[PDB]
C-alpha cells in the first residue's frame, strides 16, 4: 500500500522480494501496457538515511547495461512516498528470481549445461560492468538475480544495489544484511574489505547452479559454516558432511552435474580462483594483456 490516492492511472499488482519496508512493487498500467516496477520508500527514513536513498537512484541511472537492473525514468506518478523521498523506477521481469530456477525439482541436483553457462555469460558480464563504474555489489545473492524472457532465451540480470558500495558521494550503504549465506568472508569481520568480494558471491552461485547446493556446508548456518572451513584448503571448492557427521574437503566438482567431460577441466579451476578465502588473492593473476584477472580470463576462455 504505497498510498498515492492520485486518481488511479497506473496500478500495482504484487510486491517484490528484498529491499525494505514495502519495497518495489509490480506497477502495471490499467490503461497502457507498461508494467515497469518502482521502489516505494519505507516509513520515515532518517535524515541521515535520506541521502542514502537519493544516492541509490543516482548511481542506478548510471547503469545502462541492459544485462542488469535498469533504471528507467519515473513515470507521471512522481510525488514522494513516506516523508520527503522520491522513487526508483526500473524494468520489470516476470522470469522471477534465480531462486525459482534453483528450487525447480527438475534441476533438483544442478541445473542444465545450457542455463549454467547462460548465467556466466550474463551475470559474469554484468558483474564486470558494475566494476567498470567503481560500483561493487557484494550482496550478490541468488535472490537478487531476476530473469526475463527477452525474445526467446532467458536473460539473467543483477538487481538491487541498496547495499552495494561505491566511491562517489555515498561510501557504502549498510553494514549487516539479512540471512547471509552467499557473501565473501570479508564483511564477516568488518575489516578492510576489497573489490574481490563480488567474485566470491558470483562463484558460490555458479557452483550451486551445477550441484544444487552451497559449495561448503549446505543448510548450515554461516555462523559455524565458517569456522569449519575457516582455513578451507587451497583451491578447495567443496566440503560436505559425511553420513557419520564427519567433514570432508575436496577441490573437485561433485557429481552428478550437467557439464560435459570437457568443460569440467576449466570449470573446476575457475571456481578455484573464485573460491579462495584470501581476498586480495582470489584471481590475483591480473594479466595486463586483457586488463582483467585470471577470473574473467578462464570465463571468456570457456564461453
Amino acid at each position: 500500500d504505497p498510498e498515492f490516492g492520485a486518481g488511479g492511472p497506473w496500478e500495482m499488482r504484487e510486491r517484490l522480494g528484498t529491499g525494505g519496508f514495502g519495497n518495489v512493487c509490480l506497477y502495471q498500467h490499467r490503461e497502457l501496457d507498461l508494467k515497469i516496477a518502482i521502489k516505494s520508500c519505507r516509513l520515515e527514513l532518517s535524515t541521515k538515511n535520506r541521502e542514502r536513498w537519493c544516492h541509490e537512484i543516482q548511481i542506478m541511472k548510471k547503469l545502462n547495461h541492459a544485462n542488469v537492473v535498469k533504471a528507467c525514468d519515473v513515470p507521471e506518478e512522481l510525488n514522494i512516498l513516506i516523508h520527503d523521498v522520491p522513487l526508483l523506477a526500473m524494468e520489470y521481469c516476470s522470469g522471477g528470481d534465480l531462486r525459482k530456477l534453483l528450487n525447480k525439482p527438475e534441476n533438483c541436483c544442478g541445473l542444465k549445461e545450457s542455463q549454467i553457462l547462460s548465467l556466466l555469460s550474463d551475470i559474469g558480464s554484468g558483474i564486470r560492468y558494475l566494476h567498470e563504474n567503481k560500483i561493487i555489489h557484494r550482496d550478490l545473492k541468488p535472490e537478487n538475480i531476476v530473469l526475463q524472457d527477452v525474445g526467446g532465451k532467458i536473460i539473467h540480470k543483477i538487481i538491487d544495489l541498496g547495499y552495494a558500495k561505491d566511491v562517489d558521494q555515498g561510501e557504502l550503504c549498510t553494514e549487516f544484511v539479512g540471512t547471509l549465506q552467499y557473501l565473501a568472508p570479508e564483511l564477516f569481520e568488518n575489516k578492510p574489505y576489497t573489490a574481490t568480494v563480488d567474485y566470491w558471491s558470483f562463484g558460490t552461485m555458479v557452483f550451486e547452479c551445477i550441484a544444487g547446493y552451497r559449495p561448503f556446508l549446505h543448510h548450515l548456518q554461516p555462523f559455524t559454516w565458517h569456522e569449519k572451513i575457516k582455513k578451507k584448503d587451497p583451491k578447495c571448492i567443496f566440503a560436505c558432511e559425511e553420513m557419520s557427521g564427519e567433514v570432508r574437503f575436496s577441490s573437485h566438482l561433485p557429481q552428478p552435474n550437467s557439464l560435459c567431460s570437457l568443460i569440467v577441466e576449466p570449470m573446476e579451476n575457475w571456481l578455484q580462483l573464485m573460491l579462495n578465502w584470501d581476498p586480495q588473492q582470489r584471481g590475483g593473476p591480473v594479466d595486463l594483456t586483457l586488463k582483467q584477472p585470471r577470473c574473467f580470463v578462464l570465463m571468456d576462455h570457456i564461453l
Partner: protein, 352 residues
C-alpha cells in the same frame, strides 16, 4: 509507586504518556501536552472514559486508578477544540523487516525456527490494529457522552428560559390591565377629582415600554432551534458508531491466531518452511483497518461538530434570560410609578 497517565490523542491516534508528580496540577500538565501535540493550552479539552470533560478543580491527581490494577487502563482522550473535523494526522506502527518478508515475498520458504517469530509478531500486529481500534472507538463514545451532557445542560436552561418568559408575559398582562386601568379612571375626572399635566406623559410612557418588550415569543429563534439540534443529536445516535464493524476485524484476529496456533501445535517443527498463508490475514486486516478507521472519524465529525453548535447557542440562552429578567425587573418596580405616584399625588387637598 508512580502515576504515568496515558493520554490518547483523538486527533492523531497517538498515546503520549506523562509521569505526573504528586504535586503538579492539570493546568501545569496541559502545558506539557501542548509541547507534544501543538494544541493550544486553552483548546485542550481532555475527556475521560466516563465522557466527562476535564477538571480545572482538582490537580493532576485525577487519573490514579486503584480498583482494577492501576496501569494501562484509565487512559484519557485528548480532544481539540479548534479542529472541527479530524483529517488524518494519525499514524500507525510498521511490521518491521521481520514481517516485511511475509508481505513482500509473500510465498517464501523460511525456517520455522524463525517463523515462530515473524508469524508471532505478525499476529500481534494483526490483533494490534484491532485492539488499537477499540481505543480510538472509545474516544468517540466518550466524546458522545460529552455531547449528550452538553445537550442536557443546554436544554435544562431552555425549560427555565421559557418558564422565565412565562413570568414576563404573565406580568405584562397584569401590567397592561393596570396601566390603562388608571387612564380610564383619570379621563373621567380631569375636572372633578384630580387632574395635572406633568404625569400626563410620565404614565403614558410605561404603557409603551411594556410594548417594545415581550421576549416570550422571541424564544422562537431558540425553541425551534434547540429542538432542531436536540432531536438531531439523538438522531445522530441512530447512525452506526464505529465498533459496528470492529467485530468484522476481530474475526481477522482469530484467523491469525489460528495460524500461529498451527505453527507450534502442528506435527513437528524445527524444519518447517512456509509463510504464504499468513499473507492472507495480514492483507485483510490492513484493508479493514483503514476503512473503518477514517470511517470512525467521519461519524465523529458530526458528533464533535454538534458540541460547538450547543456551546454556540449556550450564550444565546443567557441573552434571553437577561433580557426577559431585565423587563421582569423593570416592570416589577414600575408598580411604584403606577401606585406610589398616586399617594405622592394625593395630599394635594389633604392640607386645605
Amino acid at each position: 509507586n508512580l502515576k504515568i497517565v496515558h493520554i490518547l490523542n483523538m486527533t492523531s491516534a497517538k498515546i503520549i504518556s506523562f509521569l505526573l508528580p504528586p504535586d503538579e496540577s492539570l493546568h501545569s500538565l496541559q502545558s506539557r501536552i501542548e509541547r507534544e501535540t501543538g494544541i493550544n493550552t486553552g483548546s485542550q479539552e481532555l475527556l475521560s472514559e466516563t465522557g466527562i470533560s476535564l477538571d480545572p478543580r482538582k490537580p493532576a491527581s485525577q487519573c490514579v486508578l486503584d480498583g482494577v490494577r492501576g496501569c494501562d487502563s484509565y487512559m484519557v482522550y485528548l480532544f481539540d477544540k479548534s479542529k472541527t473535523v479530524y483529517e488524518g494526522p494519525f499514524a500507525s506502527r510498521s511490521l518491521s523487516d521481520c514481517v516485511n518478508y511475509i508481505v513482500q515475498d509473500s510465498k517464501i520458504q523460511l525456517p520455522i525456527i524463525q517463523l515462530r517469530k515473524v508469524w508471532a509478531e505478525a499476529v500481534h500486529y494483526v490483533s494490534g490494529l484491532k485492539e488499537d481500534y477499540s481505543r480510538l472507538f472509545q474516544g468517540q463514545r466518550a466524546a458522545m457522552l460529552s455531547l449528550l451532557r452538553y445537550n442536557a445542560n443546554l436544554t435544562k436552561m431552555k425549560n427555565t428560559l421559557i418558564s422565565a418568559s412565562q413570568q414576563l408575559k404573565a406580568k405584562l398582562e397584569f401590567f397592561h390591565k393596570s396601566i390603562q386601568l388608571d387612564l380610564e379612571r383619570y379621563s373621567e375626572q380631569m375636572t372633578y377629582g384630580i387632574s395635572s399635566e406633568k404625569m400626563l406623559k410620565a404614565w403614558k410612557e410605561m404603557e409603551e415600554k411594556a410594548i417594545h418588550y415581550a421576549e416570550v415569543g422571541v424564544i422562537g429563534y431558540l425553541e425551534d432551534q434547540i429542538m432542531s439540534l436536540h432531536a438531531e443529536i439523538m438522531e445522530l445516535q441512530k447512525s452506526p458508531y464505529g465498533r459496528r464493524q470492529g467485530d468484522l476485524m476481530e474475526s481477522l484476529e482469530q484467523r491469525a491466531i489460528d495460524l500461529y496456533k498451527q505453527l507450534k501445535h502442528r506435527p513437528s517443527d524445527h524444519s518447517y518452511s512456509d509463510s504464504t498463508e499468513m499473507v492472507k490475514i495480514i492483507v485483510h486486516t490492513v484493508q479493514s483497518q483503514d476503512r473503518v478507521l477514517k470511517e470512525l472519524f467521519g461519524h465523529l465529525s458530526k458528533l464533535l461538530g454538534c458540541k460547538q453548535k450547543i456551546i454556540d447557542l449556550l450564550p444565546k440562552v443567557e441573552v434571553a434570560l437577561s433580557n426577559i429578567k431585565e423587563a421582569d425587573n423593570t416592570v416589577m418596580f414600575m408598580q411604584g410609578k403606577r401606585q406610589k405616584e398616586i399617594w405622592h399625588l394625593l395630599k394635594i387637598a389633604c392640607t386645605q
